[PDB]
């Protein structure tokens, strides 16, 4: 009870000055317990959809449904907001695995919205996480316009369980054959756009895997598997949504919460 206790605490307090709401999951793997604060509160995913997108694909492959080096062609008029990959690649097309990269490690937008096209969209997306005995996410629409975050709305959105649950299903547990949640667990641990937010907070021997959101309305969010130095791994998802500080604060509020993970 002590550190659930502590931990409920210090997130109500990072919450109280934030001007938002902070969710926040941690998955002890060593007991199958999970913490936090807001657990089965509602919080817009933005780009942390993308796990579970990369998620879908790899369980299609082990299925023999989709293949890795299968080539996607797209058009200027699929490019979005936010696709630094995709966006050098309209000539030459890209593979499967190259878009499920981009998506995950540089969180391409183009490269998720060809991921979503390839299996049924949102609602292939949605019928997954059910998959996975997920019965609080939902995704509704592709980028960018996902990631509106108004108050209240119950599109796009999951909670820090339930993203923790199938954040630990995909990589750990057994969503995935071996070879696909490896796969997974590699393109987390090259993620690039987490340097400011539980990758700074965490202790600097252990090891992270994570895929980082951020949208409207004061939104950031930050899902990890951590391996700590000789203890279990944890699964921890942050979500902090209508947040009022600026946006820096919003990296440093969930840092701080990696921090009162390890401590
Ligand atoms: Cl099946
Ligand atoms: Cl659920």
Not at 36 to 62: I, Q
Not at 143 to 152: K, P, R
Not at 231 to 257: E, H, M, S
């Amino acid at each position: 009870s002590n550190a659930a206790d502590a931990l409920a605490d210090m997130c109500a307090r990072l919450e109280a000055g934030s001007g938002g709401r902070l969710g926040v999951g941690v998955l002890d793997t060593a007991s199958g317990r999970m913490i936090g604060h807001r657990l089965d509160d509602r919080f817009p995913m933005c780009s942390t959809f993308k796990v579970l997108a990369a998620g879908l694909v790899l369980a299609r492959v082990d299925r023999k449904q989709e293949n890795l080096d299968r080539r996607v062609s797209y058009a200027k008029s699929d490019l979005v907001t936010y696709s630094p990959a995709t966006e050098k690649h309209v000539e030459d097309g890209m593979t499967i695995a190259e878009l499920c990269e981009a998506a995950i490690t540089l969180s391409d937008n183009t490269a998720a919205n060809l991921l979503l096209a390839s299996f049924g969209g949102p609602a292939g997306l949605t019928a997954f996480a059910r998959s996975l005995g997920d019965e609080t996410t939902r995704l509704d629409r592709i980028e960018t316009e996902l990631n509106e975050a108004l108050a209240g709305d119950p599109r796009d959105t999951t909670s820090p369980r339930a993203m923790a649950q199938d954040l630990r299903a995909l990589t750990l547990g057994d969503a995935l054959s071996p070879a696909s949640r490896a796969q997974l667990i590699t393109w987390l641990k090259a993620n690039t756009t987490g340097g400011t937010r539980l990758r700074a907070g965490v202790p600097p021997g252990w090891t992270v895997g994570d895929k980082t959101g951020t949208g409207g309305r004061g939104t950031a969010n930050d899902i990890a598997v951590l391996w700590p130095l000789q203890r279990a791994p944890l699964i921890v998802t942050v979500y902090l949504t209508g947040a009022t500080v600026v946006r820096d604060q919003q990296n440093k509020i969930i840092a701080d919460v990696g921090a009162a993970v390890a401590g």
